[PDB]
Design a protein around this ligand. Structure first.
Ligand SMILES: CC(C)(C)c1ccc(CN2CCN(S(=O)(=O)Nc3ccc(SCCc4ccccc4)cc3C(=O)O)CC2)cc1
Ligand SMILES: CC(C)(C)c1ccc(CN2CCN(S(=O)(=O)Nc3ccc(SCCc4ccccc4)cc3C(=O)O)CC2)cc1
Length: 151
């Protein structure tokens, strides 16, 4: 409920922030073997591969959306809201969305819009949690994500 949004926000905000700045957080999210720390380490491995694989489509979509400020993020979130609430729900579709978020975050860092990374992460979290709540809960939350992408 409140915890599923708070946990997802902590993982996504930290992943987007460290991808843009290019530096991992010196202060951990929790204890050594916590669900959130494991999900973030999985995101660093999986999410980075998604970005290089989907590079051309990610660069295309970014250029078409034309994100330059916070209002652009808030307004074009309605585009994301509608496209994501329709279609098959899976971990591959979930990880590609977060990877696009990190791709956008990296772009925002270059145009001196580092303040946009947090409301950007809030938009991704609110879509994922609100539209796909039942699925995520039945899939053991972020543990299901860790289990799904194991090496
Ligand atoms: N408009 S929106 O309500 O903001 N939501 C959307 C924004 C973009 C799209 S991309 C597919 C629609 C398309 C078809 C042919 C040419 C151009 C676009 C879909 C929606 C939506 O409605 O699911
Ligand atoms: C917070 C902001 C930055 C505003 C923001 C976030 C995220 C998005 C959308 N976000 C969806 C999920 N993907 S994806 O996982 O790569 N898979 C897809 C990629 C393309 C499409 S076609 C409609 C997208 C479109 C519409 C109009 C212009 C440019 C693109 C569908 C999917 C899918 O699976 O439904 C990434 C794109 C938009 C806007």
């Amino acid at each position: 409920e409140d915890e599923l949004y708070r946990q997802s926000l902590e993982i996504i905000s930290r992943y987007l922030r460290e991808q843009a700045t290019g530096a991992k957080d010196t202060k951990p999210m929790g204890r050594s073997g916590a669900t959130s720390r494991k999900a973030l380490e999985t995101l660093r491995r999986v999410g980075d591969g998604v970005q290089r694989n989907h590079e051309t489509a990610f660069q295309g979509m970014l250029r078409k959306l034309d994100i330059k400020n916070e209002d652009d993020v808030k307004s074009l979130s309605r585009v994301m809201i509608h496209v994501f609430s329709d279609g098959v729900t899976n971990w591959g579709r979930i990880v590609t969305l977060i990877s696009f978020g990190a791709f956008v975050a990296k772009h925002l860092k270059t145009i001196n819009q580092e303040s946009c990374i947090e409301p950007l992460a809030e938009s991704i979290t609110d879509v994922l949690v609100r539209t796909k709540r039942d699925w995520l809960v039945k899939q053991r939350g972020w543990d299901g994500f860790v289990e799904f992408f194991h090496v």
